[PDB]
């Protein structure tokens, strides 16, 4: 199957280095121009660099001049991005993208899922999970506060996947502490409160932290 | 570096036609491409070379480019078209791919009032020395809202964060969390915590509140 798989992402301290790899499969890799495109959280698309099939012609944006170096191993069907002297402006999801040309113009016709690069001095920390308890007052709302974790991402499920209707898991906000925080809410019948058990399942892979949390009234 | 100007937002009722603009000086002379990006997803080309359509892309997407404006047209807008849309060119002067700032497609629907819930900090969180107070606004429209924190009738400022979900795929509504963040100390030297919601769905502002204890 035709796909691109970025890897090598994660947390890097300011001033330090990171190398990304992209593995292509399902197509003839040596025939194409290949690009890296990035996207800062909640922001737009920014092309970073690209390299010609033979690996001798390369272009960069000014923001990464002298810091980033792109290369390729055609035998390994692989693309690389060497990132030096990283700063917060480099924090982004990095995408591997294939270039297409057909006598008119150039666009990207294939993307990987991307790898997240976090430039921060924050230490990896699991979230503390607190219950948003149902009020004693139809529809009831309850939820879980997922607090002070680093880095992204974190997943939340309810009742191990059994409960999905009316579930809202909010996007995390970055706090001044440098830590992330979010809430996951759900609306349920006010009658189910005494009967039905509600458990939020919080998973934070960068710290290997799973938390199951029973949310009940009072 | 060549400049592409996109409107940050485009609104459209279901079944109607959306038009997304990409503006550039003589952008008609150069080729323009369009990408759709759904939440948590990699971008996907929907139109390339001004007007051409990739295989697998529905006919509803069409493109045009002339003078100083390229246009992505989405006809009979349906479930799944709610996304971010980026125009793209290759600047052959400074030699870089250039993207537009992006346009979010919003689905128009009827005003819907939020159900409002307030959550006092749990006891376990107070053991850690911080109190997070949460106001929930559930399933409302439009997105614009005013959530005001009142602590003992004092309008708060600088100590709350808002977070809002994407438009719901089924009912096109939003949900919003507002979180009031205090030290446990600041929390226990007050009594009345209230979030006040001002929304187009409400005839008069709605207040949910609690007393410590």
């Amino acid at each position: 199957e035709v796909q691109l798989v970025e890897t090598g992402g994660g947390v890097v301290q300011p001033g330090r280095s990171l190398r990304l790899s992209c593995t292509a499969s399902g197509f003839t890799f040596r025939d194409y121009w290949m690009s890296w495109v990035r996207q800062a959280p909640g922001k737009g698309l920014e092309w970073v660099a690209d390299i010609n099939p033979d690996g001798i012609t390369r272009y960069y944006i000014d923001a990464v001049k002298g810091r980033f170096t792109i290369s390729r191993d055609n035998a390994k069907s692989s693309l690389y991005l060497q990132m030096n002297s990283l700063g917060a402006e480099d924090t982004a999801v990095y995408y591997c993208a294939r270039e297409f040309h057909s006598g008119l113009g150039w666009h990207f016709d294939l993307w990987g899922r991307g790898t997240l690069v976090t430039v921060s001095s924050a230490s990896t920390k699991g979230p503390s999970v607190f219950p948003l308890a149902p009020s004693s007052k139809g529809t009831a709302a309850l939820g879980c506060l997922v607090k002070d974790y680093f880095p992204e991402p974190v997943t939340v499920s309810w009742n191990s996947g059994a409960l999905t209707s009316g579930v809202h898991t909010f996007p995390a906000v970055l706090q001044s502490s440098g830590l992330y925080s979010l809430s996951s809410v759900v609306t349920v019948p006010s009658s189910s409160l005494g009967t039905q058990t509600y458990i939020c399942n919080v998973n934070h892979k960068p710290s290997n932290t799973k938390v199951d949390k029973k949310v009940e009234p009072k | 570096s060549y400049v592409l100007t996109q409107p940050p937002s485009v609104s459209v009722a279901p079944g109607q036609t959306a038009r997304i603009t990409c503006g550039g000086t003589n952008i008609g002379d150069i080729s323009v491409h369009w990408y759709q990006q759904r939440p948590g997803q990699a971008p996907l080309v929907v139109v390339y070379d001004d007007s051409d359509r990739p295989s697998g892309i529905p006919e509803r997407f069409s493109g045009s480019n002339s003078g100083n404006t390229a246009t992505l047209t989405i006809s009979r807008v349906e479930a799944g078209d709610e996304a971010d849309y980026y125009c793209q060119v290759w600047d052959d002067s400074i030699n870089a791919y250039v993207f537009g700032t992006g346009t979010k497609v919003t689905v128009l629907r009827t005003v819907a009032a939020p159900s409002v819930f307030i959550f006092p900090p749990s006891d376990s969180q107070l053991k850690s020395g911080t109190a997070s107070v949460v106001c929930l606004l559930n399933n409302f429209y439009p997105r614009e809202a005013k959530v005001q924190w009142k602590v003992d009738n004092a309008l708060q400022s600088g100590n709350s964060q808002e977070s809002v979900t994407e438009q719901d795929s089924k009912d096109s509504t939003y949900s919003l969390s507002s979180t009031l963040t205090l030290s446990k100390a600041d929390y226990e030297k007050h009594k009345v915590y209230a979030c006040e919601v001002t929304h187009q769905g409400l005839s008069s502002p709605v207040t949910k509140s609690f007393n410590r204890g």
Partner: peptide, 11 residues
């Protein structure tokens, strides 16, 4: 001068 010249992808 070490100026950028067009990548000549388009004209």
């Amino acid at each position: 001068a070490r100026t950028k010249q067009t990548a000549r992808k388009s004209t």
